[PDB]
Curated annotation (Swiss-Prot):
The gene is Lyz2. The active site is at 35, 53. Expressed weakly in myeloblasts, moderately in immature macrophages, and strongly in both mature macrophages and macrophage-rich tissues. GO terms for biological process: defense response to bacterium; defense response to Gram-negative bacterium; defense response to Gram-positive bacterium; killing of cells of another organism. Belongs to the glycosyl hydrolase 22 family. It comes from Mus musculus. This is Lysozyme C-2. Lysozyme C is capable of both hydrolysis and transglycosylation; it also shows a slight esterase activity. It acts rapidly on both peptide-substituted and unsubstituted peptidoglycan, and slowly on chitin oligosaccharides. It catalyses: Hydrolysis of (1->4)-beta-linkages between N-acetylmuramic acid and N-acetyl-D-glucosamine residues in a peptidoglycan and between N-acetyl-D-glucosamine residues in chitodextrins. It is found in: Secreted. GO terms for cellular component: extracellular region.
Length: 130
């Protein structure tokens, strides 16, 4: 239930996402990194703003995913946030796409805008043998 730059990259490329129309594998990695790669323990709830940041891709439960304990959220993904806390990231990818599919775009992770769009993050993926 753990994923690292390499792994993630491999999987991504193994899934067929790494190098998406726009989202570049490197961007994914860097992103997934800025999110909370490693172990699928990326969980940070916050009632203060009826929002929760869960998922390796640090997905907010204030719009994406849901639970059923908060009859307010607008689960745009329409899935159990827990589904993003499993072993297979299939949900993370599916949701990831189901999310980016919106007019939001990777931009949502402005972080990447201040992490990826800064230096060469290719050196991070360049080594796995991609």
């Amino acid at each position: 239930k753990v994923y690292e730059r390499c792994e993630f990259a491999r999987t991504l490329k193994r899934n067929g996402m790494a190098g998406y129309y726009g989202v570049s594998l490197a961007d994914w990695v860097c992103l997934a990194q800025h999110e909370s790669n490693y172990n699928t323990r990326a969980t940070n709830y916050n009632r203060g703003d009826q929002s929760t940041d869960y998922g390796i891709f640090q997905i907010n439960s204030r719009y994406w995913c849901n639970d059923g304990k908060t009859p307010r959220a607008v689960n745009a993904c329409g899935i159990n946030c827990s589904a993003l806390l499993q072993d297979d990231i299939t949900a993370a990818i599916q949701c990831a796409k189901r999310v980016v599919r919106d007019p939001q775009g990777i931009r949502a992770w402005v972080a990447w805008r201040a992490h990826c769009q800064n230096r060469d993050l290719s050196q991070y993926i360049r080594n796995c043998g991609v």
